[model samples]
Target: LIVNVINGPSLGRLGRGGTTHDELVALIEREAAELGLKAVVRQSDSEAQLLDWIHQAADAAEPVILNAGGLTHTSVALRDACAELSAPLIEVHISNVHAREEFRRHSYLSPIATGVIVGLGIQGYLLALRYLAEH
Candidate 1:
């Protein structure tokens, strides 16, 4: 199983930040569906809910592409949850976290991530899916 956990309070700002989120989702959903794998897109404004999804992914022993939204830059509990999971987790950032403000440089999700993909804009999702598909 493959999980795409869209964690954040600001995913609602996706297309507004000079990014094309709807189109990106369309592409990923269309491409991923062809491969017979399920892509679960869950968005959460609550930090606790995000952590719960992470636990779900870990418990499933499946692969996860986590976009923890702003929490990627600011939540230790979120990071701790990732560490507790039992699956391969990939950390993804649509914008280059390191390139943005200094505050955006950290992720509770990165330390436990199998790998991190950042600054690729909407393309990061495709890249992450490709990484899972190939591996």
Candidate 2:
């Protein structure tokens, strides 16, 4: 099986807990390999670039693990694009979005996602990967 992990905006700075974006990718890659899966991990500071990757994932009928940064709560266009995904689309957040500001509590993607994982740090990505492996 194949899984694509698409991160958006400030996620490229995901090292607060000592795991950088590159480290996160390596970890996900290793975990996916152990589960007999191929992982295509990507990060972008630009919304357009992130959308392109998600669009490709949708077109290929591939499952997606998306961390849409601030866009999760702001972009209807992004949500609409994600809605096209035929396979499971899991939304992940390294930080506990719900514990943050009131504005961060909303997600344009979560309602449409197959599942949502938050506040679990980078491990959330691996857990999402495992879900895809099992289901």
Instruction: Count clashing residue pairs per candidate.
Output: 2, 0
Q: Write the per-residue lDDT of candidate 1 for residues 12-127, one digit (tens) a residue.
A: 56776565556656767876787665677777689998888877877877777788887787888988878876766788787777777887886667778899988887677777
lDDT at 13, model 2 = 86
Q: Give the candidate number with the greatest lDDT.
A: 2
TM-score of each: 0.86, 0.97
**Candidate 2 regions with alpha-carbon error over 4 angstroms:** none
Alpha carbon lDDT at 91, candidate 1: 82
Name the top TM-score candidate. Answer: 2
Q: What residue pairs are clashing in model 2? A: none
- Which ranges of candidate 1 are over 4 A from the true structure? 17-22
